[PDB]
Amino acid sequence: STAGKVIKCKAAVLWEEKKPFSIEEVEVAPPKAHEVRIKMVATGICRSDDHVVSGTLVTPLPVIAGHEAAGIVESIGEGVTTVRPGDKVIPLFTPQCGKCRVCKHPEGNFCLKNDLSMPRGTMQDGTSRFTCRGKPIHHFLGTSTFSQYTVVDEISVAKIDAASPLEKVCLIGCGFSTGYGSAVKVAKVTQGSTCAVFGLGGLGLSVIMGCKAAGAARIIGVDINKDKFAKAKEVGATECVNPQDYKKPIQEVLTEMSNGGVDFSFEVIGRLDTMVTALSCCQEAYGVSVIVGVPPDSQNLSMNPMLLLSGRTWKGAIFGGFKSKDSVPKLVADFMAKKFALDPLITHVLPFEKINEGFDLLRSGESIRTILTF
Amino acid sequence: STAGKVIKCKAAVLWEEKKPFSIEEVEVAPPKAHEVRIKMVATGICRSDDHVVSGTLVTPLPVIAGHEAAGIVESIGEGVTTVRPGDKVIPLFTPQCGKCRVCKHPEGNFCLKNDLSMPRGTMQDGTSRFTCRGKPIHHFLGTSTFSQYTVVDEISVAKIDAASPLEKVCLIGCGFSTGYGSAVKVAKVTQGSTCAVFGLGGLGLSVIMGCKAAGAARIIGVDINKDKFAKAKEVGATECVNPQDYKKPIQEVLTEMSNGGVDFSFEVIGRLDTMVTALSCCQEAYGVSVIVGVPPDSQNLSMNPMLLLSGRTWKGAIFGGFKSKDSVPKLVADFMAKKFALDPLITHVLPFEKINEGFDLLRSGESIRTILTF
Numbered sequence: 168s169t170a171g172k173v174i175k176c177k178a179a180v181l182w183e184e185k186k187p188f189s190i191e192e193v194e195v196a197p198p199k200a201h202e203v204r205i206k207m208v209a210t211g212i213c214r215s216d217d218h219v220v221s222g223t224l225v226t227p228l229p230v231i232a233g234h235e236a237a238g239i240v241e242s243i244g245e246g247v248t249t250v251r252p253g254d255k256v257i258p259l260f261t262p263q264c265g266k267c268r269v270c271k272h273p274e275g276n277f278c279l280k281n282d283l284s285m286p287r288g289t290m291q292d293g294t295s296r297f298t299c300r301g302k303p304i305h306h307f308l309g310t311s312t313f314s315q316y317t318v319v320d321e322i323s324v325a326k327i328d329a330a331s332p333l334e335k336v337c338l339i340g341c342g343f344s345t346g347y348g349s350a351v352k353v354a355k356v357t358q359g360s361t362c363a364v365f366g367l368g369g370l371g372l373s374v375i376m377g378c379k380a381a382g383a384a385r386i387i388g389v390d391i392n393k394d395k396f397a398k399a400k401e402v403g404a405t406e407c408v409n410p411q412d413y414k415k416p417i418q419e420v421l422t423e424m425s426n427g428g429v430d431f432s433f434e435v436i437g438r439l440d441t442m443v444t445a446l447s448c449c450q451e452a453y454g455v456s457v458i459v460g461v462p463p464d465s466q467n468l469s470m471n472p473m474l475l476l477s478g479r480t481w482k483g484a485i486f487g488g489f490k491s492k493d494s495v496p497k498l499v500a501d502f503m504a505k506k507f508a509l510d511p512l513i514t515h516v517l518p519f520e521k522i523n524e525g526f527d528l529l530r531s532g533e534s535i536r537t538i539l540t541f
Numbered sequence: 542s543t544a545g546k547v548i549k550c551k552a553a554v555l556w557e558e559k560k561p562f563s564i565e566e567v568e569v570a571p572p573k574a575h576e577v578r579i580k581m582v583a584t585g586i587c588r589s590d591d592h593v594v595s596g597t598l599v600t601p602l603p604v605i606a607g608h609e610a611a612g613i614v615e616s617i618g619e620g621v622t623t624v625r626p627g628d629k630v631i632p633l634f635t636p637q638c639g640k641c642r643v644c645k646h647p648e649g650n651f652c653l654k655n656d657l658s659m660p661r662g663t664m665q666d667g668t669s670r671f672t673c674r675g676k677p678i679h680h681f682l683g684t685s686t687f688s689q690y691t692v693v694d695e696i697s698v699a700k701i702d703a704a705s706p707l708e709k710v711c712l713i714g715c716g717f718s719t720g721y722g723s724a725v726k727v728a729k730v731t732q733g734s735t736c737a738v739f740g741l742g743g744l745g746l747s748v749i750m751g752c753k754a755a756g757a758a759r760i761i762g763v764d765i766n767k768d769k770f771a772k773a774k775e776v777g778a779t780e781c782v783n784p785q786d787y788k789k790p791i792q793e794v795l796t797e798m799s800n801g802g803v804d805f806s807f808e809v810i811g812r813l814d815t816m817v818t819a820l821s822c823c824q825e826a827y828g829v830s831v832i833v834g835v836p837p838d839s840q841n842l843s844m845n846p847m848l849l850l851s852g853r854t855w856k857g858a859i860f861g862g863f864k865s866k867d868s869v870p871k872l873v874a875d876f877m878a879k880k881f882a883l884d885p886l887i888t889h890v891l892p893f894e895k896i897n898e899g900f901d902l903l904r905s906g907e908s909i910r911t912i913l914t915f
């Protein structure tokens with residue numbers, strides 16, 4: 168009863184920074200050519216969504232945020248070939264156009280069609296499909312999953328197993344895949360190695376899962392919230408340290424614990440100081456450090472380049488280095504074949520209408536992932 | 542007639558920063574256990590030696606500098622098994638102890654016995670073999686090659702082909718191997734790729750040599766001294782750019798020329814600003830940037846970590862990543878088999894007594910490598 172028509176539905180609109188989401192009626196236009204309209208089933212609350220509220224991540228407002236989700240195709244636009252109505256899908260916050268220089272490179276995944284580097288808050292054609300109170304509303308990362316219905320470009324959606332449990336596999340749309348791939352694909356953690364993981368939220372626990380899958384012998388979790396240590400050890404950490412417990416800088420502590428530096432370190436918080444600390448605690452001649460966390464907008468870090476001249480490697484990645492449309496369906500299939508677990512990341516399940524309580528749980532330190540159900 | 546005795550010889554002593562070297566008589570003690578005393582034959586002038594004079598590279602003074610050299614063993618201490626009197630040798634400014642975690646690692650080369658990180662200016666045992674005017678003089682990087690005779694630890698010397706031309710292969714002790722390896726071993730430049738090389742001195746020309754050996758399709762040399770361009774093209778650069786010729790920042794020119802960023806970039810100067818520029822000019826999702834230049838002591842750079850989050854890899858290396866004692870004899874063998882050329886790097890030859898003129902040539906921009914003969 169909705170194909171080709173405007174849909175009126177519920178969404179969580181962010182009208183301005185540092186305010187609660189406003190749960191109210193929006194209008195969702197039908198998909199144009201090469202676009203897909205999706206009925207949302209589940210969406211996770213990721214720290215990157217909170218970064219929009221806090222001003223840490225700048226994107227045009229007002230906006231419908233949300234990017235870690237799964238749903239069912241309601242209708243498709245002219246020329247769509249990769250999904251059909253009724254299909255289960257995961258929106259892709261990093262597109263895979265398949266035709267740019269990055270998509271064609273064996274090691275690149277940050278497709279040049281992304282809306283992250285110079286955010287416009289639109290669809291690929293530069294316009295918006297959302298209206299609220301008569302006003303146009305921006306999209307977020309080409310996904311906008313905090314809504315009962317969204318419209319995405321075809322290059323930003325992947326079809327997944329029809330038997331998938333959507334309230335779990337939405338995490339493959341961001342948190343799991345990003346952390347897991349940061350360990351197994353970006354860092355390329357080796358068997359028998361020592362790893363250090365800064366930040367033990369949903370992303371950091373997924374990094375730990377990847378370090379353990381890669382055969383690391385030691386995995387040191389680092390967090391200022393000791394309530395995060397129990398779950399980190401359940402998913403593979405061999406020990407946890409709270410920097411606030413020590414009188415010396417944690418890079419010195421980790422270098423001593425590791426008899427000279429760790430093999431792999433990961434910054435999974437989003438602080439400039441912990442990015443430099445994580446680089447410093449990896450072994451000076453052969454260590455590798457990977458930045459996953461998102462730093463505050465337009466702020467530079469300061470570091471001594473001798474940390475690199477001795478032999479260290481420093482890198483970062485979006486979405487765990489995974490080519491999004493190729494990888495998301497394979498990752499769902501791996502989950503269905505029991506190759507990794509997602510339940511350890513899920514601490515809370517709430518109806519979508521309680522989105523603000525879900526953010527309060529994240530901000531208070533009490534949750535890993537809250538999954539919102541529509 | 543000198544074994545077991547103190548040798549009185551000439552050396553170039555640096556008594557204080559920013560002053561000419563003083564060519565005068567020194568006393569060189571005989572080698573203790575596991576040490577080797579070498580009659581020097583030829584030594585190159587590298588910018589790192591000038592960094593000692595300028596205070597850019599801090600090591601205790603007074604000092605006998607020099608680290609790029611080749612000579613003949615005069616005598617060996619007790620227990621030495623890897624060289625004999627009469628052998629041709631190259632001193633190793635990065636040792637290879639064979640026993641530390643770095644030496645045992647498949648990719649590491651910055652041996653933990655190095656005298657770079659926390660410089661003492663001594664032999665491994667914490668003492669010096671040099672006296673001048675009755676005063677003890679420091680060593681430099683365990684090599685101290687600006688002297689007619691030096692004493693090195695066994696882990697800091699490699700035996701080379703007895704037919705080697707010492708006035709050429711001294712460059713394998715530093716400039717050639719560092720630049721060549723930075724391309725072929727550290728960056729792992731790929732066939733058909735586009736490279737940018739910042740700084741076209743002895744080290745940068747050697748990077749170009751490695752990029753060409755690796756099969757790069759384009760190699761863009763970058764230097765503010767346009768007189769360096771002709772030789773850079775002779776050894777493989779396909780084009781050269783002078784940043785002072787442009788109204789836009791050079792990362793912008795290079796991104797434009799490479800249709801979105803280069804595959805590999807190399808900083809081979811030693812400036813904080815060009816380290817950040819070189820990182821920025823490599824492609825944001827899959828580019829690799831290698832720091833080779835030495836930054837000024839204790840200074841930090843400032844950079845936006847979003848340059849890394851998009852997917853860039855940033856690394857540095859000492860000595861082109863080569864394990865020194867294993868690699869130097871193989872590199873000499875390759876030179877003897879005509880696998881690479883050293884003559885393009887040698888622009889001037891002077892007697893050792895004219896060392897100060899050789900440094901004047903480097904500082905004026907006129908030379909690539911001056912080789913000093915003893």
Ligand SMILES: NC(=O)C1=CN([C@@H]2O[C@H](COP(=O)(O)OP(=O)(O)OC[C@H]3O[C@@H](n4cnc5c(N)ncnc54)[C@H](O)[C@@H]3O)[C@@H](O)[C@H]2O)C=CC1
Nearest residue numbers: 214215366367368369370390391392436437460461485486
């Ligand atoms: N590179 C990518 O593609 C993606 C990046 N991100 C970013 O990853 C980061 C982590 O996201 P989540 O796991 O969802 O966040 P989270 O808020 O659930 O976890 C962050 C953890 O960092 C801890 N922490 C905070 N300050 C700390 C400090 N000084 N020292 C040690 N620990 C500290 C917190 O206690 C918390 O447990 C965020 O910046 C997020 O924006 C998220 C997903 C995709």
Ligand SMILES: NC(=O)C1=CN([C@@H]2O[C@H](COP(=O)(O)OP(=O)(O)OC[C@H]3O[C@@H](n4cnc5c(N)ncnc54)[C@H](O)[C@@H]3O)[C@@H](O)[C@H]2O)C=CC1
Nearest residue numbers: 588589740741742743744764765766810811834835859860
């Ligand atoms: N990582 C390692 O193991 C080693 C590092 N080094 C360092 O490599 C660097 C290069 O050494 P050399 O080739 O012997 O020095 P060099 O002085 O012969 O060459 C440096 C080049 O950089 C150019 N240059 C200077 N400022 C520039 C600027 N703003 N922009 C563009 N070009 C600029 C100069 O005109 C010159 O041609 C030095 O810092 C040296 O200390 C040297 C050997 C071993």
Ligand SMILES: O=CNC1CCCCC1
Nearest residue numbers: 213215234260341461485
């Ligand atoms: O969490 C999902 N995406 C993130 C990727 C890193 C930049 C901010 C958005």
Ligand SMILES: O=CNC1CCCCC1
Nearest residue numbers: 587589598634715835859
């Ligand atoms: O040029 C030779 N060695 C250099 C290596 C980089 C640090 C300073 C000394």
Ligand SMILES: [Zn+2]
Nearest residue numbers: 264267270278
């Ligand atoms: Zn693309």
Ligand SMILES: [Zn+2]
Nearest residue numbers: 213215341342
């Ligand atoms: Zn996310």
Ligand SMILES: [Zn+2]
Nearest residue numbers: 587589715716
């Ligand atoms: Zn040198």
Ligand SMILES: [Zn+2]
Nearest residue numbers: 638641644652
């Ligand atoms: Zn060693």
